[PDB]
Design a protein around this ligand. Structure first.
Ligand SMILES: *Cc1c(COP(=O)(O)O)cnc(C)c1O
Ligand SMILES: *Cc1c(COP(=O)(O)O)cnc(C)c1O
Lengths: 396, 396
């Protein structure tokens, strides 16, 4: 059976890690990292999280199955985080949330749900986007098309080309948007560009699908949801796949949610029954630990205050490195102006490097970045900033 | 988009729970339960598990992503549990294990893997089998056919009909076997019937797929794997989907494994790369907590001794109830002989009740069983045995 099986190609993101661990050179610098690192290059478990795990250890009395859509408390906390408390969507009972195995798990359940109970056939993803979007949607037999987004010259959001592309998107098509901290560019629309996209969206009949994995990393918790909120006010239907892997540092516990929004409770309930059927046939019910940690933190004022503080600390550190990066580059002799870096949000930035330059940075200087040019700013520290900038410059 | 969506039908197993919680009658008895309950009707977290969680709380330094196939330690412990240490499969490096979100998650990844990189088109499931098998395989676009298995008269394994049916199974088809404690009948083949199936299997070119969710519940850890071991000795390729939900009481943490076995390491490695690609596109990487608990327990002699003891205790309790059930039935006036119950393994038993009798037990006596007649013996206690047997008899 398996003799004919062809080896699968290297994952563009994860495969880099393998090359890195094998590069026995000492001065190594891994910037193609998808997670957060702190000042010492460590990725610790949050204190709020450790506190929540202690509470769970001495309070859990059973590990009995969770129920297809998971912990209810978790579901409402995510809804409030996403839509706010003064949300008509929540008061009209128009949204339903299913706890899933991470943000990827949410995208897949959305994908299977749509492919099986809907006439959706195409999903529009940005160019570029997170490499795994394509594989997730294609896994469900949906075709992935892409709209323009990035301006390789001015290093900005080419809004005209964006809208120009989306015109080929027909009614009934799913259009995917990153809530904030666009992976891999770091370029997000403005509240004004979002409101324009929201209107264009309802007028054209697109089904929006927000991938939300970095809430709290751009400006703040509520500020980061303004784009989603703009859409939620004008659309009857909507789908948001959220992750708590990065903002809670709960990566390996697989915590995420797939939120379904329909015209009324009667409809979203009917549609949600088919979403639960898709989970039942996939992983059955979700992992309790991570989601449990998120629900207890978010529901306890003391713990939530510590978490939010830990989150702003992470956010502030990334902003500090974006600034120090641009500066160090300049004093190291950079010819090109990298000020646009300071304009980008979150952990990632398209360094504006060519396939050949990143390849050269890797084999000659030991600096690792994703082939696309994506660089993770949280992989920089005041200790490795200089070596990094010298290599980058020597390759310019 | 969602206005046309039809409500999904009630899950045959999970939907019963909903009816139960709504039946405000006091004397309720839920036997259609899929999990273990102890003497007091509770389903506690194991002591070995609590001990392992404490150890993890004070030793984990990061929640960083796990890597597609999960914790290595976990992978080898499951392989030893499944094949034994004096296993050629392990020494020849012919098996590869991927940690998955439970046993259902393992079945789905196997299913997507086979449907996409293989010419498999049909899976043969027993009649009857666990209701979710069909949905999992159909979710991957594979067709599910069923072989005879149960003898509704003698309440045994109709081996002749079994083999008779499997003859329509062609080479390249996947044949699914329950490792032990057949869900829902409790009827398992004997070592002799297993060896016959193993030979018939290699001669016909079937791809075996063992669903292993109750290792340690029939006779014991090693004894329960004899059927799988018989097959592993004569087959070049094989797939086993295991779960630790029931034998570790880790239900909601989603702990399971999908083990791939091929002719040699070179082949299983090539084939495994495509299995990891299927996970990446589904949930990305697995939940660490549950698997972490299983790996630390299984690797520590002290903790593993306590676990095994807790497991034998569970096993012994089920065997006690099977005996008390048959006895109480007899002294309550049972006309039919239920001795066959004592012959069955694990938590489940096909009570040999009609659709109308279970329906009557439910609405008139408040006794809940799955429509198939499946009853969970671990749902009985010395306290509710009498009321239960009186209802069952009054319905005979
Ligand atoms: C990290 C990420 C995901 C995946 O979330 P997990 O929680 O890691 O599965 C999905 N989308 C984007 C854009 C991401 O960056
Ligand atoms: C319980 C069960 C499963 C599912 O395992 P989880 O670990 O609960 O996903 C699969 N197969 C059978 C036969 C089972 O009884």
């Amino acid at each position: 059976m398996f003799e004919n099986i062809t080896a699968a190609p290297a994952d563009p993101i994860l495969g880099l890690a393998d090359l890195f661990r094998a590069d026995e050179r000492p001065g190594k610098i891994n910037l193609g990292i998808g997670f957060y690192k702190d000042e010492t290059g460590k990725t610790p478990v949050l204190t709020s999280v450790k506190k929540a795990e202690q509470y769970l250890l001495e309070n859990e009395t059973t590990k009995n199955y969770l129920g297809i859509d998971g912990i209810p408390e978790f579901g409402r906390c995510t809804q409030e985080l996403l839509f706010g408390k003064g949300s008509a969507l929540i008061n009209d009972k128009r949204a339903r949330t299913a706890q899933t195995p991470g943000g990827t798990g949410a995208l897949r359940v959305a994908a299977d749900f749509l492919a099986k109970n809907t006439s959706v056939k195409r999903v529009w993803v940005s160019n570029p986007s997170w490499p795994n979007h394509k594989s997730v949607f294609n896994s469900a037999g949906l075709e992935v098309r892409e709209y323009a987004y990035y301006d390789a010259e001015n290093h900005t959001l080419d809004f005209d080309a964006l809208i120009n592309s989306l015109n080929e998107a027909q009614a009934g098509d799913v259009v995917l948007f990153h809530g904030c901290c666009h992976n891999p560019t770091g370029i997000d629309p403005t509240l004004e560009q979002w409101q324009t996209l929201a209107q264009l969206s309802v007028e054209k009949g697109w089904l929006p699908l927000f991938d939300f994995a970095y809430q709290g990393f751009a400006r703040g918790l509520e500020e980061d949801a303004e784009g989603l909120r703009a859409f939620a006010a004008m659309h009857k239907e909507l789908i948001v796949a959220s992750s708590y892997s990065k903002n809670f540092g709960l990566y390996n516990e697989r915590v995420g949610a797939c939120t379904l929004v329909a015209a009324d409770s009667e409809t979203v309930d009917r549609a949600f029954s088919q979403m639960k059927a898709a989970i039942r046939a996939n992983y059955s019910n979700p992992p309790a630990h991570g989601a449990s940690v998120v629900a207890t933190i978010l529901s306890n004022d003391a713990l939530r205050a510590i978490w939010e503080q830990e989150l702003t600390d992470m956010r502030q550190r990334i902003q500090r490195m974006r600034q120090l990066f641009v500066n160090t580059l300049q004093e190291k002799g950079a010819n090109r102006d990298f000020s646009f870096i300071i304009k980008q949000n979150g952990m990632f930035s398209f360094s504006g490097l060519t396939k050949e330059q990143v390849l050269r940075l890797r084999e000659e200087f030991g600096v690792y970045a994703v082939a696309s040019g994506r660089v993770n700013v949280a992989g920089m520290t005041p200790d490795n900033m200089a070596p990094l900038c010298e290599a980058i410059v020597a390759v310019l």
